[PDB]
Symmetry: C3
Subunit: 174 residues, 3 copies
């Protein structure tokens, strides 16, 4: 049982790649060499009062950690850049999520900029019955009350279904 | 031998020290001392999210030295189940029902709070979304494009139009 | 006997001492030893990818299969002098940046807060944009729709025509 020592040793920490995802069960199968695992858990960003979900992709690289080389109970740590998921940025001053559809969410502390960028689609901020929606063709604000505090300038036309009440002058140009 | 076994341990969070940023964990019948966990970031940018009681993870201890082991959380279980099952979305879900998610099939970023508030603040400017209101506040508010209001419009100051102003 | 050195080498406490941004690699130090250029575990490397380079002085652990440290991988995120715990709440999830910016959700207060001391927040979808900066909030789109009673605390300037479906009433 001395070869078992180096066996367990070698099996404790394994470089591996995702080959299968059981989404409903939240498990992955990984491959290290010509060995394929059973259904194993991956470490997510949070699994408590807060939970995060981001299933590892097939082809994603990481490391499997198995207590005493008990590989049937190993857990997977993804996030190794590779052909299935390359480094999405190269800046010393940025924290960036990039998605397959070209979307990205990034903070840059050199430029002091938070950027939510979608080539197409919708960004939605909803709290109860209130909503800010940014889409390809519109920005919409919906609420029981819409309050604009400050000088407002409209570069365009304005159409109002209900009454318009002004506390000052109302002056046209035509 | 014993080092071998002690180097990588399956464990569950059993106590949290918020001020010290440490947790105690349990593996089998063994309970650890106060240990650090690996956060998402600990450099120029830092992230904070304390592991919860009952949160499962792994303890890594160099040369079996469990007194200095570090904890990697995030294993789904009773204290925190997988909050989604989609292959095309990335989701934060919170205990109060709030969620922040991006879906790359639908091309949608969604920030959803059942109740409460979302605040985007830059210097003195703010966009605030709450149960009863959306409010914009800034030294200058600029709307570029044709504006349509389904409702009434009340303006405290003057209304100055560059064209005609017509009622019905 | 030779297994001891290997065991010891499999899991190492370490600190970043060099960063190669272009190659996405780090050199770490443990004891008197400095690694070659090694990979770190990012938050995501699949269809979804995340980027956040470990900082010099950031502490973590190196994992090396069979003690082969030349192929070791780095797990960062151990709070230390190069980056301390940025919060202490049991009810928050928080990013805190070096310029004082923060993004945080608090589930006791039911609040999502994006806070920048200065700079810009930009939400861009196609050609539409909501932008918040020190001196302005701007909405830009082929169409801007406000659904609900709108109250303006200030003056209103409109370059184009104004059409009202009810009364238009001034003070003067
Ligand atoms: Ca032996
Ligand atoms: Cl246990
Ligand atoms: Cl790399």
């Amino acid at each position: 049982v001395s070869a078992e020592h180096d066996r367990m040793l070698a099996a404790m920490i394994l470089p591996c790649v995702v080959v299968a995802v059981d989404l409903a069960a939240a498990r992955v199968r990984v491959r290290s060499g010509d060995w394929t695992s059973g259904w194993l858990r991956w470490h997510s960003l949070a699994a408590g009062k807060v939970r995060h979900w981001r299933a590892p992709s097939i082809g994603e690289q990481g490391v499997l950690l198995s207590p005493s080389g008990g590989v049937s109970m190993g857990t997977f740590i993804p996030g190794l850049y590779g052909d299935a998921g390359t480094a999405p940025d190269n800046s010393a001053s940025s924290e960036t999520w990039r998605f397959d559809d070209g979307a990205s969410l990034s903070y840059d502390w050199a430029a002091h900029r938070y950027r939510v960028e979608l080539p197409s689609g919708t960004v939605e901020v909803r709290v109860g019955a209130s909503e800010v929606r940014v889409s390809d063709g519109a920005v919409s604000l919906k609420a029981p009350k819409i309050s604009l505090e400050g000088p407002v300038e409209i570069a365009g036309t304005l159409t109002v279904s209900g009454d318009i009440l002004g506390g000052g002058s109302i002056i046209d140009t035509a």
